[PDB]
Amino acid sequence: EHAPDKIVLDHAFGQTILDKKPERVATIAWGNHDVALALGIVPVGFSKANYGVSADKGVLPWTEEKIKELNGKANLFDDLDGLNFEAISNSKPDVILAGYSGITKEDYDTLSKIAPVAAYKSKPWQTLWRDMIKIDSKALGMEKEGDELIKNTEARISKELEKHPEIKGKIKGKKVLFTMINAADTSKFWIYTSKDPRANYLTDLGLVFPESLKEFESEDSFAKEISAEEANKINDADVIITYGDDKTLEALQKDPLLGKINAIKNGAVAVIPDNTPLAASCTPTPLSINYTIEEYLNLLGNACKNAK
């Protein structure tokens, strides 16, 4: 008989309407569970991770830590291969958090037969970390707590910067590009745009994007593939970030085309050790940030020392 007030979510597939204070929270895709956990809520189910951790564990250190602290269990969807609708349904969720995600219209329609879905605003994988919090927390009926979580996460970042005066000054205003450069094939590579949370996080640390990036912001993607032939377009970058290994930088500087790029020949390159918790953290969540920001700043400060 009682009709509690509704939460109405605007997103890429229209609207989601649910009753205030949903109890059982499922999440899907990268990082959304870290929002629930940061807000003190243990999901009845969330997506398995296999980047920066083994599929066997399927959970990152900061996530595992927060769960244990909340005296909870980790209920993982066996969904590395794709959404596991059966597993999601069996968790009997009152809501499904997908604020940062790549779901299609068909995914959305099917998930919605299980529970109300908090989808991304516009485009797949184009949700910045603050907006992930805004979307997911509003779905929980916890907008206010979400804003407070954003403010505390911003404070965490600011605190760590203040503790490293040299690094803070050294990276401030450096023009940076987050990329994916495969040393085993340099004919083409990827540049993440400002719409990608991992590129955008860098601006939270005081870095900026070079003007060259704007050429690639027009396409509706979180990343653009460009040929080595175009590599000279980004000679205005002070520093470049890429995933890789201890062989990556050497290989790049020796490359006939990539080796002529200013930041690369300068050694102004932060190589994130691939498939590590640190690599995972570069797509930030409120939990990952606290856990890794010191290590990340040191890596960034060190690459920026080489900028000329």
Author numbering: 34 to 341
Reproduce, without paraphrasing, sentences from the article in which this PDB structure was first reported.
Pia system is responsible for the transport of hydroxamate siderophores such as ferrichrome and ferrioxamin B, whereas Piu system for the transport of heme from hemoglobin. The overall structure of PiaA is composed of an individual N-terminal and a C-terminal domain linked by an α-helix.
A crystal from 2.4 M sodium malonate and 0.1 M Bis-tris propane (B3P), pH 7.0 was applied to soaking with 300 mM KI and eventually enabled us to solve the structure (termed PiaA-B3P) at 2.0 Å using the phases obtained from a SAD experiment at the iodine edge. In the structure of PiaA-B3P, a molecule of B3P with two conformations binds to a cleft of PiaA. Superposition of apo-PiaA and PiaA-B3P against the ferrichrome-complexed form gives an RMSD of 0.31 Å for 262 Cα atoms and 0.45 Å for 283 Cα atoms, respectively.
